[PDB]
């Protein structure tokens, strides 16, 4: 017999399946003998200590900044002072150097939130002695000469001695649940074009510059013995907190600046000498 098929359905034709998404469904055709065969990860596979998320990379400690602390530095003096924004290191100048892991990966997202962790390693010995105060300042910032303004915020006083390192969680205290990135979502300028006001006026967005600052002031002046150095360097590490969050994938704010060469055809393009 050859009976008629009365079954039918309305359809909406699309060219690709799950093109925008990182997961879900795919209409990908395997270039294989067996169409459902896949790569084996029985022996060779990702090692368990390797990061699985961008948040895992953000949990790696990275050296952000350094500053000197000497016996000449009078009490109340700012040893360190920065806007602690993981979007941009500077708002008013170019950056070039080794950016921290948490800053690198945060540069890929339009939004960030959660506490930021700092660690201050004092490159000293047992004969160095002094006290500093670390302060997280929000909304309103303190004068350079007014230590009392810094003392009125969220502070941690560290007595330098036998212990030469101190940890500091910077609280997330803002009017919004997340903060948008100060870097651009998309920047088509590739050849260091001389900027004008018309270029800025036709930008992708407006930079919401952070007023949150972290400062380090002298409490007790550094008083080392005559036999050792009078000045020491302090290494400032940074990473995302345990509840650090990222969202809204965008154009990367940072890009490699060292040993960048585009690929050529090997061996056609003059490899045979």
């Amino acid at each position: 017999d050859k009976p008629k098929d009365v079954s039918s359905i309305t359809i909406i034709p699309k060219p690709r399946l799950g093109f925008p998404h990182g997961k879900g469904k795919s209409d990908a055709v395997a270039m294989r003998v067996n169409p459902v065969a896949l790569t084996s990860f029985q022996d060779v596979s990702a090692y368990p200590d390797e990061p699985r998320t961008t948040l895992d990379i953000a949990r790696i400690w990275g050296l952000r900044s350094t500053f000197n602390w000497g016996s000449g530095d009078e009490h109340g003096k700012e040893l360190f002072n920065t806007v602690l924004d993981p979007g941009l290191r500077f708002y008013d100048q170019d950056y070039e150097g080794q950016i921290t892991p948490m800053e690198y990966v945060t540069g890929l997202y339009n939004f960030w939130s959660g506490p930021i962790e700092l660690r201050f390693d004092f490159v000293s010995n047992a004969f160095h002695t002094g006290t500093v105060i670390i302060s997280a300042e929000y909304n309103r910032s303190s004068t350079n000469t007014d230590e009392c303004q810094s003392h009125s915020t969220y502070t941690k006083t560290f007595h330098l001695g036998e212990q030469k390192s101190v940890h500091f969680t910077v609280p997330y205290i803002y009017d919004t649940v997340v903060r948008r990135n100060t870097a651009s979502a998309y920047l088509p300028v590739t050849d260091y074009d001389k900027v004008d006001n018309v270029s800025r006026a036709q930008a992708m967005g407006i930079r919401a510059e952070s007023k949150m600052r972290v400062k380090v002031r002298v409490v007790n002046v550094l008083r080392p013995v005559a036999s050792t150095t009078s000045t020491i360097e302090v290494l400032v590490y940074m990473r995302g907190g345990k509840n650090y969050a990222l969202h809204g994938l965008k154009q990367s704010t940072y890009w490699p600046s060292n040993s960048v060469v585009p690929i050529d055809s090997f061996p056609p393009d003059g490899y045979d000498p």
Binding site: P15, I60, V166, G248, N258
Partner: protein, 243 residues
């Protein structure tokens, strides 16, 4: 990877860790490395296919610093902002990758001519763009798609787009993501270990195409290298919130 909590010997009191913002705005989490690598990157934007050649070669490798544009260098067919994509930035941290890649190819046509996409396994070379294989001047009688290799056809009149998944047909355990200098003439077998093969597009008549790339479902990365030395000038091309 070294977290560095090892070095953190201080055990004094600290402020609260609080509560995560993950899930508050939406459940669309975008932190997974695999999820970031599985969304597509534009390689070639409206590039010509010419039937005088064997075909347009695409080397099977993920986006990275290898395909990064630098102001002043010679003009290539590649997209200039490949190096500034999220997944390129991620791949700059991992020098090993294993598994399949997926290539979305769109032919700028509505004609009934078939355009063939042939997979070449790891042969040891690394090329891209239009090439005359063995420098001949005729390839219609000896097409690459009819030599024996695995091939798929696009028929633009039906569908101008396709998504093809290329296997990990190589000798090595891992594929090398990047080198310090991509144009350096070093040990020739090591030179070719940055790819796992090629994808060759051959037309009937002259026509343009666009090419995207992403990671497959069966895909892994390893050999964490950490962040490199970088530069930015994003600040300069935007106004602040105080005019």
């Amino acid at each position: 990877m070294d977290t560095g909590a090892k070095e953190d010997e201080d055990e004094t009191a600290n402020f609260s860790d609080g509560v995560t913002a993950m899930g508050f705005q939406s459940l669309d989490t975008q932190v997974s490395i695999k999820d970031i690598l599985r969304r597509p990157v534009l390689l070639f934007n409206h590039v010509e296919l010419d039937p005088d050649y064997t075909g347009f070669f695409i080397p099977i490798m993920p986006p990275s610093r290898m395909m990064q544009y630098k102001s002043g260098d010679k003009e290539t067919s590649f997209q200039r902002l490949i190096g500034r994509t999220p997944q390129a930035a991620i791949m700059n941290l991992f020098r090993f990758w294993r598994g399949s890649l997926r290539y979305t190819i769109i032919i700028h046509s509505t004609d009934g001519h078939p355009i063939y996409v042939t997979h070449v396994p790891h042969t040891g070379n690394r090329v891209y763009g239009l090439m005359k294989v063995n420098n001949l001047h005729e390839y219609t009688k000896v097409p690459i798609f009819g030599c024996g290799l695995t091939t798929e056809m696009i028929i633009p009149s039906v569908n101008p787009s396709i998504c093809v998944e290329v296997p990990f047909d190589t000798e090595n355990n891992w594929a090398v993501t990047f080198d310090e200098d991509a144009q350096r003439n070093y040990s020739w077998r090591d030179k070719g270990d940055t790819v796992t093969g090629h994808l060759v597009v051959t037309p009937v008549v002259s026509v343009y195409m666009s090419v995207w790339v992403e990671a497959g479902d069966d895909f892994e990365v390893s050999n964490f290298y950490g962040p490199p030395s970088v530069k930015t000038n994003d600040w300069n091309y935007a106004f602040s919130d105080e005019h």
